[PDB]
Write a protein that binds this ligand. Structure first.
Ligand SMILES: *CCC(=O)Nc1ccccc1-c1cnc2[nH]ccc2c1
Length: 293
């Protein structure tokens, strides 16, 4: 049930090499560019598929050309079997690198640095009027190039939603909106099936880091969406920060004090990182855990 078989050629330029991603709403593929000879990420959506998501993916991707932490947009096109998008290919994702770590934990060096780069791409997308809503390790990756290999990127805009309007006002929230994502990094907003904000992409960020440092989350074992929520709804979030820098009592207070509407203070959270980095002699020119330096 693969949309393209190998050695298929889209638009006489992109020879499919293998599948690399699947899911409900599309398949992803490594392709050789036959024009420019580099390889590339070709994502594809069935033409008939009900939930025409890819197109909206390609709008976010296009508004974000210019920004860092975004794959270069190569091309898109549709025909009577599948719609396609072409973009730059990236390296190991964070989930996979995190598991590679002996203890399943990054140093605080690598965590705080990742922190800074993930937060930019979040602000970035907020800036062009979209929530990611599905923020997780496996949704970020590293470059594979001299020019990018120490660069962490953002993948998927599948679950993305616009929160503004044509001008720049905040769309009104739905009275309900059913969480459609990954439980482990879901806010309590999402568990309560309330319309997600920019703060909810920042809750996700918060929990991602805690797991990169500490190496686990309280609920990591559970897969019941409802349970997890009830635990997260009852848990003391300061208990996570017991082995984490004291600058993360601010990040937590800040996001616990936001709603849908209220814009987050991105600079504040960018400091919690840069301060904690400083009170620890951590430089950006430091190696990452996976590096063999
Ligand atoms: C530059 C993009 C990259 O390396 N990864 C990628 C490439 C091509 C298509 C998709 C992705 C991607 C998109 N959405 C996703 N949702 C879950 C996982 C992914 C990966």
């Amino acid at each position: 049930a693969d949309i393209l078989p190998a050695n298929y050629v889209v638009k006489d330029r992109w020879k499919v090499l293998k599948k690399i991603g699947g899911g409900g709403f599309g398949e992803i593929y490594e392709a050789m560019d036959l024009l420019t000879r580099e390889n590339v990420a070709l994502k594809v959506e069935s033409a008939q598929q009900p939930k025409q998501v890819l197109k909206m993916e390609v709008a976010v991707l296009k508004k974000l050309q210019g920004k860092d932490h975004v794959c270069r947009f190569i091309g898109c096109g549709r025909n009577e079997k599948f719609n396609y998008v072409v973009m730059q290919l990236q390296g190991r994702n964070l989930a996979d690198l995190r598991r590679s770590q002996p203890r399943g934990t990054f140093t605080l060096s690598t965590t705080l640095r990742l922190g800074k780069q993930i937060l930019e791409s979040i602000e970035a997308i907020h800036s062009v009027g979209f929530l990611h809503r599905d923020i997780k390790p496996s949704n970020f990756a590293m470059g594979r190039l001299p020019s990018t290999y120490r660069k962490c990127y953002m993948l998927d805009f599948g679950l993305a939603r616009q929160y503004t309007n044509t001008t720049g006002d905040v769309r009104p929230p739905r009275n309900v909106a059913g969480f459609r994502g990954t439980v482990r990094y879901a806010s309590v907003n999402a568990h309560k099936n309330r319309e997600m904000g920019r703060h909810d992409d920042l809750w996700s960020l918060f929990y991602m880091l805690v797991e990169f440092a500490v190496g686990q989350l309280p609920w990591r074992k559970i897969k019941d969406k409802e349970q997890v929520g009830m635990i997260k709804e009852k848990y003391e979030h300061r208990m996570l920060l017991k082995h984490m820098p004291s600058e993360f009592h601010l990040f937590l207070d800040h996001i616990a004090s936001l709603d849908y509407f209220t814009k987050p203070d991105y600079q504040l959270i960018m400091s919690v990182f840069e301060n904690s980095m400083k009170e620890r002699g951590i430089a950006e020119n430091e190696a990452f855990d996976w590096e063999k330096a």
